[PDB]
Design a protein around this nucleic acid. Structure first.
Length: 78
DNA sequence: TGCAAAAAACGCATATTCTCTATGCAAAAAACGCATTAATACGAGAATTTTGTAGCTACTTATACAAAATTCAGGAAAATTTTTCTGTATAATGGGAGCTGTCACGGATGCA
């Protein structure tokens, strides 16, 4: 539920990363791969929401995708 | 402007005579013969002698085992670059972008 609940601000990552040469949706479903990768290692008794930590994953999970994703030649990040 | 007609030239009488056609002289070529000498070739002698044939001998090579002294193909470390994975903590709370001037056809639904 909290997962499904924290599925609004995600649009921020979508907008910031439009589609990253892919698809708005795929740039949010891959962001969903985040969310879960928050909860778990979201950190309770922390002192504030994953609003500064959930994103964190989010944007580190998209990116990784995005560019893993999408040019039909994988690229090394280097 | 018709000729009859005269003198000198221009045509029928020979000397001259002089290119001229005509034979004996003579001088040196030539070529023929007496011929002489030398040289081009035949006769004999034995001397070199190369080629042709045999056996011995030295060089050259046919061959049979193989790990020479050297090449190479993997195998397994590094070495450094690169790749994939994981992680970094305030708040942030519904998405733009053309379709609106085509003509005609064939179903297929909706709407009383």
């Amino acid at each position: 539920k909290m997962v499904q609940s924290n599925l609004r601000l995600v649009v921020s990552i979508a907008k910031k990363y439009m589609n990253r040469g892919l698809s708005f949706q795929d740039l949010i479903q891959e962001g969903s791969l985040g969310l879960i990768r928050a909860a778990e290692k979201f950190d309770h008794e922390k002192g504030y929401k994953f609003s500064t930590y959930a994103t964190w994953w989010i944007r580190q999970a998209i990116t990784r995708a995005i560019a893993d994703q999408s040019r039909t030649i994988r690229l090394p990040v280097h």
